[PDB]
Structure 1
Amino acid sequence: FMLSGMEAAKAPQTHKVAGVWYGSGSGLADFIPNLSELMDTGEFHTLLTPVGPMVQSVHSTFVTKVTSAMKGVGLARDEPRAHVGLTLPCDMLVDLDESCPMREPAG
């Protein structure tokens, strides 16, 4: 949300927190000095590779270790026989299955 520079009313739920997750966006845009021209050639989607959910944060003052998960159900870290589910912002989800109840079968 912050690296984009997208608008307020497009997603007004996290914009309150996206300025207290981080600063005014200059703490992130210093690493990528091309975001005014990565938009031009239209190649930002060619660079991302999705990963999935997190499992474990190991943190320090300088360098943060992140042990992620692909391929399936990441086993948790706090308790044995526990599984990490994906979590979301409700701002960014847009469902498609719903309508007025008015039927199409499930799978």
Structure 2
Amino acid sequence: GSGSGLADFIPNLSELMDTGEFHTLLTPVGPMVQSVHSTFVTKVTSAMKGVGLARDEPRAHVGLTL
């Protein structure tokens, strides 16, 4: 939306940016492998420690997209 569909979960976005705590609260995880999507809840399987095996295409490798 305009951005307030996400900002209601973090009411401290004004105050985490002042003192500078926002980098201490993110932990980098890695690229996606699979997302099984439902209506209210989305399941997401990501990959740490190396090249994650692709689910839908066999024998394949998921690379990172920026």
Structure with a larger share of its residues in strand: 2
| Structure 1 position 83 matched with structure 2 position 61 | yes
**Larger Cα-atom Rg:** 1
CA RMSD of aligned residues (A): 0.5
Per the TM alignment, residue 42 of structure 1 is displaced from its structure 2 partner at its CA by 0.4
* 1:78, distance to aligned residue in structure 2 (A): 1.1
Residue ranges of structure 2 left out of the alignment (5+ in a row): none
More helix by share: 2
2:5 is paired with a residue whose SS is helix
Structure 1 residue runs of 5 or longer lacking an equivalent are 1-22, 88-107
Q: Does 1:48 align with 2:26?
A: yes
1:13-43 CA-partner distances (Å, limit 9, x unpaired) = xxxxxxxxxx000100000000000011101
Identity score, percent = 100
